[PDB]
Amino acid sequence: SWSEAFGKGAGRIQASTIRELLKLTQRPGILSFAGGLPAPELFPKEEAAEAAARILREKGEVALQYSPTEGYAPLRAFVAEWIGVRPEEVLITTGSQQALDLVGKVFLDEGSPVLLEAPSYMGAIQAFRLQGPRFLTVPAGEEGPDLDALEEVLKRERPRFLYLIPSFQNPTGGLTPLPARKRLLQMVMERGLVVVEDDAYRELYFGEARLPSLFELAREAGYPGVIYLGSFSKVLSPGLRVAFAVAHPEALQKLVQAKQGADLHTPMLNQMLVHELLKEGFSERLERVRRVYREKAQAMLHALDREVPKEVRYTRPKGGMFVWMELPKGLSAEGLFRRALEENVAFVPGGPFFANGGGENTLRLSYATLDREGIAEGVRRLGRALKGLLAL
Amino acid sequence: SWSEAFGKGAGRIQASTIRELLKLTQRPGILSFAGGLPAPELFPKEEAAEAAARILREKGEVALQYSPTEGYAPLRAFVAEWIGVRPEEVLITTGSQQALDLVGKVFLDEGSPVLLEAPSYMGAIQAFRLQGPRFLTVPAGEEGPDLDALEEVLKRERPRFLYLIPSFQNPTGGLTPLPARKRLLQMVMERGLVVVEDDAYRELYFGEARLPSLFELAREAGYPGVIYLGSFSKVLSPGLRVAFAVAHPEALQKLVQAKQGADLHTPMLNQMLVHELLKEGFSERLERVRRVYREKAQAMLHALDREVPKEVRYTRPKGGMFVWMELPKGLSAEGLFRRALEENVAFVPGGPFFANGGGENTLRLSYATLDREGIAEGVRRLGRALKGLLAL
Ligand SMILES: Cc1ncc(COP(=O)(O)O)c(CN[C@@H](CCCC(=O)O)C(=O)O)c1O
Ligand SMILES: Cc1ncc(COP(=O)(O)O)c(CN[C@@H](CCCC(=O)O)C(=O)O)c1O
């Protein structure tokens, strides 16, 4: 009997709705506002092809061979220069999703408290839940985490770490403002707490400039407790699975040793390809990806303003890939999903973004994948489904 | 500070000596008998370059995008055809190292019994150790595990699974014979036990044919309890990080959900590239791989027979990448390691292959990486170092 054969871990293991939706959304005719999949037109497939061939011809014996866990050295150096750290502080990971898995392994045990936002990224919840922690949450909004709520929790609990996405939070799109970051840093430093800062959407700001990361603020202050996660997924290629973690040597060593057991190393070809593509013109590329997402966000907001009844509330992003919607408390996002799917529109129901449940009346919308036309038509269909279900 | 902050997992995390040795061995000038790194001239650099470039040009929107966790469909289909199963029974993983991580997560909890050989593959020990299990061991030799010893364990203990490498075991090189495979299957079936069969070296047999796998024997008998692992690492490219697990649907689903949290999915370019490289001429490539390793094995044995004193014992492989050496109780492998390295020769001391300690007089030699001359020359230095150490 498999249920009898499985360990406790298997009982905590549940499928990710984002992961499962991809099987639906990659089918033709589906208008996807579901997974945060980058606009296909942004993939530099032609340039990647030329670079991959060159790597394999000129350096194939390196690209194809086992390599040390820490990563391709020129890639680590590039990340170090970009982030403002030294190459030896950088671990290359197989997507930031891997860094989440690793931090879970290093910090969490059965019953151990961990703190994140409600809602937060379901892939983090999933990775952490494997360890059987006790989730503590504080509400998150358009302005980031409720720091009065956080203050209350920290008087009562000592979380193993705080998992936060200060820049264009998944799924709310929230941007934690600078005074709030500084306040958070103080709260963390006073208690000597660990922060896991997920900066997946770092470069996808729509305004004039990005805000300093918690990690930059900690480094300025000389606080070693921020583990910084970044990824090439949203800026170049999610499919390559190449990302990085930066951390104090002791924490970094454990992440390294956990990674050895997880996959040995991130594939070398992929690391080398990322470095070849980005070593020249990265700033110019980042400007283009910001422009593309800004335009899609603008189209999305215009369509929502037009099509959605004004009893329904939704966030207005200043960056990233997501709009977060809240239905009159009573209306089910899962019910809404069924109706929208009949009209070939997919979104992510909000429930699974809440680590302790609730949020059955919320949903996440991604404007990353569709063109202007698809966004307007998808939202039109959504509005109609919304109006129908509000009536009943 | 960090030690206080870490969870119980951090204390069970230690570095792999194989993984650490690569930092040393990849440097020019060192003759490596350490990590089982495939012969570089076996890498199809030019064909890979053409295939990677074509994949990215024609299918970049797929290769560079997020993809479902289960894997690239034509690859699952290829594997299924090769192994003799259906596509739906295959999970593509990020090297078989990931499969080991995943089976640990699905089956083991703090204090849960796991059974493996003494010695066994250190990457499996390291992956499993994370979960806090109790390692139960049985001795392994040239003919595989001690089945009388296994019987005695099984009367008293119910392991969450048995981890075995019946074909060219790491590190002993042992081949579990067919009668022993059939006996093992009977013990497993009588007690309804789960087996994790790691077949990394499946195709690297030196004789006229391979033995039926425990998975194949199980399937013939209609027993669903063997989880079968394979890899493209030893037959194509380890650096690509592409492997597979085949299992009963309930087991496979939990492995899938655990993988979602581990890395989302194995990189897509890599899977498509493996498929493109192997879709024609796989049998012919396999025959060539077998010839190359047989030759290196022959060279290794020729040189050991001639350079090594007769007090020292070593296995004679019928396949795979390894020779396992036992020093006459009184010699330290760590001491021999110090001496050999002064001579630019690296191997893996045997201790870390023993999950519960021991084996300080043992070491593993790999003939995979060096050519015939390098093997001859490395072994003569090793032999000279050994004799010197034997003298005192
Ligand atoms: C805050 C945050 N951190 C980590 C990740 C994982 O991305 P990588 O592993 O770095 O590609 C993500 C993934 N974001 C998208 C992409 C997931 C798409 C998928 O799993 O199919 C989403 O939530 O839809 C994230 O939002
Ligand atoms: C029985 C067995 N199972 C799984 C693995 C992991 O290989 P993949 O992740 O499939 O590349 C291995 C890897 N074997 C080699 C290669 C590891 C090289 C390295 O970690 O640098 C060794 O033990 O030296 C293995 O022997």
From Swiss-Prot, chains A, B:
<keyword id="KW-0808">Transferase</keyword>
<dbReference type="GO" id="GO:0047536">
    <property type="term" value="F:2-aminoadipate transaminase activity"/>
</dbReference>
<feature type="binding site">
    <location>
        <position position="170"/>
    </location>
    <ligand>
        <name>pyridoxal 5'-phosphate</name>
    </ligand>
</feature>
<feature type="binding site">
    <location>
        <begin position="96"/>
        <end position="97"/>
    </location>
    <ligand>
        <name>pyridoxal 5'-phosphate</name>
    </ligand>
</feature>
<keyword id="KW-0663">Pyridoxal phosphate</keyword>
<feature type="binding site">
    <location>
        <position position="66"/>
    </location>
    <ligand>
        <name>pyridoxal 5'-phosphate</name>
    </ligand>
</feature>
<dbReference type="InterPro" id="IPR004839">
    <property type="entry name" value="Aminotransferase_I/II_large"/>
</dbReference>
<protein>
    <recommendedName>
        <fullName>2-aminoadipate transaminase</fullName>
        <ecNumber>2.6.1.39</ecNumber>
    </recommendedName>
</protein>
<comment type="similarity">
    <text>Belongs to the class-I pyridoxal-phosphate-dependent aminotransferase family.</text>
</comment>
<feature type="site" description="Recognizes the side-chain carboxyl group of acidic compounds">
    <location>
        <position position="19"/>
    </location>
</feature>
<dbReference type="InterPro" id="IPR015422">
    <property type="entry name" value="PyrdxlP-dep_Trfase_small"/>
</dbReference>
<dbReference type="GO" id="GO:0030170">
    <property type="term" value="F:pyridoxal phosphate binding"/>
</dbReference>
<keyword id="KW-0032">Aminotransferase</keyword>
<dbReference type="InterPro" id="IPR015421">
    <property type="entry name" value="PyrdxlP-dep_Trfase_major"/>
</dbReference>
<comment type="function">
    <text>Catalyzes the transfer of an amino group between 2-oxoadipate (2-OA) and glutamate (Glu) to yield alpha-aminodipate (AAA). It can also transaminate glutamate, leucine, and aromatic amino acids. It also contributes in the biosynthesis of other amino acids such as leucine.</text>
</comment>
<feature type="binding site">
    <location>
        <position position="170"/>
    </location>
    <ligand>
        <name>substrate</name>
    </ligand>
</feature>
<feature type="modified residue" description="N6-(pyridoxal phosphate)lysine">
    <location>
        <position position="259"/>
    </location>
</feature>
<dbReference type="InterPro" id="IPR015424">
    <property type="entry name" value="PyrdxlP-dep_Trfase"/>
</dbReference>
<dbReference type="GO" id="GO:0019878">
    <property type="term" value="P:lysine biosynthetic process via aminoadipic acid"/>
</dbReference>
<comment type="subunit">
    <text>Homodimer.</text>
</comment>
<dbReference type="Pfam" id="PF00155">
    <property type="entry name" value="Aminotran_1_2"/>
</dbReference>
<feature type="binding site">
    <location>
        <position position="241"/>
    </location>
    <ligand>
        <name>pyridoxal 5'-phosphate</name>
    </ligand>
</feature>
<feature type="binding site">
    <location>
        <begin position="231"/>
        <end position="233"/>
    </location>
    <ligand>
        <name>pyridoxal 5'-phosphate</name>
    </ligand>
</feature>
<comment type="pathway">
    <text>Amino-acid biosynthesis; L-lysine biosynthesis via AAA pathway; L-alpha-aminoadipate from 2-oxoglutarate: step 5/5.</text>
</comment>
<feature type="binding site">
    <location>
        <position position="364"/>
    </location>
    <ligand>
        <name>substrate</name>
    </ligand>
</feature>
<feature type="binding site">
    <location>
        <begin position="198"/>
        <end position="201"/>
    </location>
    <ligand>
        <name>pyridoxal 5'-phosphate</name>
    </ligand>
</feature>
<feature type="binding site">
    <location>
        <position position="36"/>
    </location>
    <ligand>
        <name>substrate</name>
    </ligand>
</feature>
<dbReference type="InterPro" id="IPR050859">
    <property type="entry name" value="Class-I_PLP-dep_aminotransf"/>
</dbReference>
